[PDB]
Design a protein around this ligand. Structure first.
Ligand SMILES: CN(C)C(=O)NNC(=O)N(C)C
Ligand SMILES: CN(C)C(=O)NNC(=O)N(C)C
Lengths: 95, 95
């Protein structure tokens, strides 16, 4: 149905419509990243990154695994992955 | 730069992160549509559609032309067009 798929799409976009969460998703769009790598690449403060990761997890958009003492995040919803890949390609392209 | 392109991307997503505006964009993603066609397809109330179209116009995402007494809207930002096409394809696909 058009309504329920429009609400799921709208909800993904609400999760992505935040500069910090979008940047996390863009970094994960190129492959799995440790938390250390994400924080190295992001200028966001650690407490903010932590909430943002939790929100992306709640929304079903990221998952994570432990390897030793490292936490690796990755994209988990393939619809969101493709949307973010399009955003990343389109908005990182110069004119 | 990563910051200014991340803000433009984030702003597109904020404009898209609304069920009514997203549905308009999804309909325009398949080609130019008259206002009459858009309102026939949308269940949204006319005053709401009017504000939503105005917002999409302000954001640079849609443009329009007049042919006789008909107003035709179309997508105007190609980055947004591709993002919406990915949303439409991904979220209209069944499992
Ligand atoms: C648009 N966006 C979030 C993005 O990251 N684009 N990529 C770059 O801007 N560089 C310099 C790699
Ligand atoms: C055509 N049809 C029944 C359909 O669901 N298309 N998908 C969408 O329109 N969205 C907004 C996900």
């Amino acid at each position: 149905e058009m309504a329920t798929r429009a609400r799921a799409a709208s909800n993904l976009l609400k999760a992505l419509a935040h500069e910090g969460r979008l940047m996390i998703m863009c970094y994960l769009a190129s492959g799995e990243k440790s938390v250390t790598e994400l924080e190295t690449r992001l200028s966001t403060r650690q407490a903010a990154v932590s909430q943002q990761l939790a929100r992306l997890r709640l929304e079903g958009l990221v998952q994570s695994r432990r390897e030793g003492k490292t936490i690796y995040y990755s994209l988990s919803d393939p619809r969101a992955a493709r949307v973010v890949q399009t955003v990343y390609e389109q908005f990182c392209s110069g004119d």
